[PDB]
């Protein structure tokens, strides 16, 4: 049974720590990790909820395959050339892309002009809520740090309050053991009364 009391057993030292783990070393040289120590936890379920699609997305990164990326070169619009422009499909690709990019830029302009009205406030609004979160979290941090230190104090209080009673009883016990063995020698010394009784019987 583990019965350590670290606020009472203050004589413990790193040199004793090295000695203690040496004994555990000579144990675990023979004592081996053979039982399933995890039987109180469930069997893990790493693929719960995932779709047949997402299982393949797990497999690629389990393989450490690189993530596929969208080709964004459409925004730069690579130019065709007349030696390739003989196919309608090239121009039908290029021109329709050029029409599509004109609207993306147009919507970008509208978004940027609206962003110029309202981003400076909504970012300030965002930062205010973010400061509220941080100060609430720091309030929680301070509260829990005090709670952790209280548990140390309650443990120290209980262990030392018992510890003084242990010290008193232990000091008492060793005094009785030494005294009782002394009385054993004394009672066998007084058995020299056999000498008196033999002398008294054969005066």
């Amino acid at each position: 049974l583990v019965d350590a009391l670290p606020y009472l057993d203050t004589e413990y030292n790193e040199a004793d720590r090295q000695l203690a783990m040496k004994l555990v070393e000579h144990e675990c040289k023979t004592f081996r990790p053979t039982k399933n120590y995890l039987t109180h936890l469930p069997v893990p379920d790493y693929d719960a909820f995932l779709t047949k699609c997402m299982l393949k997305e797990m497999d690629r990164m389990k393989k450490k395959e690189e993530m596929g990326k969208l080709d964004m070169s459409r925004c730069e619009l690579p130019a065709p050339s007349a030696v390739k422009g003989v196919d309608r499909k090239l121009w039908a690709k290029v021109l329709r892309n050029a029409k599509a990019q004109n609207e993306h830029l147009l919507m970008r302009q509208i978004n940027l002009e609206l962003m110029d009205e309202y981003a400076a406030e909504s970012y300030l609004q965002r930062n205010k809520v973010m400061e509220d979160l941080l100060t609430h979290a720091e309030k929680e941090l301070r509260k829990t740090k005090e709670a952790v230190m209280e548990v140390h104090a309650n443990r120290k209080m209980a262990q030392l309050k018992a510890g003084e009673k242990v010290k008193q009883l232990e000091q008492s016990w060793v005094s009785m053991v030494t005294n009782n063995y002394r009385m054993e020698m004394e009672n066998r010394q007084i058995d020299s009364d056999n000498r008196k009784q033999i002398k008294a019987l054969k005066l």
Binding site: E27, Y181, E184, R188
Partner: protein, 75 residues
């Protein structure tokens, strides 16, 4: 985490064996205070190495007369 927990519990379990052995040594010592009143080994390795070496051919090849799994299924 589950790998490290298995190792941690293993080390704690091994530590409880040391605790138990030492706790009994202390109890026997305190009991003594509380009541204080005034070629055999060579043969085995030779035999074991013989035994474990003769096995090695059987380990390489099983007997050809061994009953098949499909036969033991009809016991």
């Amino acid at each position: 985490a589950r790998q490290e927990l298995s190792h941690s519990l293993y080390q704690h379990d091994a530590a409880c064996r040391v605790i138990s052995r030492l706790s009994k040594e202390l109890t026997a010592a305190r009991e003594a205070l509380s009541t204080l009143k005034p070629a055999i080994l060579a043969k085995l390795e030779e035999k074991s190495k013989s035994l474990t070496a003769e096995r090695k051919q059987r380990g390489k090849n099983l007997p050809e007369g061994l009953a098949k799994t499909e036969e033991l299924a009809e016991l």
